[PDB]
What does this fold into?
Amino acid sequence: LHKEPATLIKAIDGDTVKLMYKGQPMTFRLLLVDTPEFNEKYGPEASAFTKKMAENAKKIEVEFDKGQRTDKYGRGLAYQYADGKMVNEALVRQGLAKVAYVYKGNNTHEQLLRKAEAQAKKEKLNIWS
Ligand SMILES: Cc1cn([C@H]2C[C@H](OP(=O)(O)O)[C@@H](COP(=O)(O)O)O2)c(=O)[nH]c1=O
Ligand SMILES: [Ca+2]
It folds into this structure.
């Protein structure tokens, strides 16, 4: 897989963000994770985390997997990086997302994220407290 450029348009919540990709505004849904909705426990904390990571980044990138690049709602499906750090993985390591929605053929980073989830669960962080 490879990273491609994007720029931040606006934070949305823990697992969605509005980015400009190839010069067009699009909402992205982060692959392989599920954050609580804003109205649920840890939803606001997940939103704050990804808003900070994205807004402080000098360089945002997106990486598509091998499979579907948009979902049935027209959201782009990717892994998002902020100054080289994967947001998807960071959420999971902090106990602010569960590994979820693992569909065959868009699951390249599944085991990386499961290892983060195991470390978050060991530490009893956030969702795992
Ligand atoms: C992460 C992801 C979600 N989706 C669809 C499955 C879920 O359908 P339903 O809306 O029918 O539940 C929805 C979950 O996203 P949200 O967690 O953003 O609500 O998005 C995909 O199709 N592919 C994906 O990789
Ligand atoms: Ca969600």
In short: Residues 15, 29, 31, 34, 71-72, 77, 101, 103, 106 surround thymidine-3',5'-diphosphate (ligand 1) (CB under 6 Å). Residues 91 and 107 are 17 Å apart (CA to CA). The helical segments are 43-55, 87-93, 110-122.
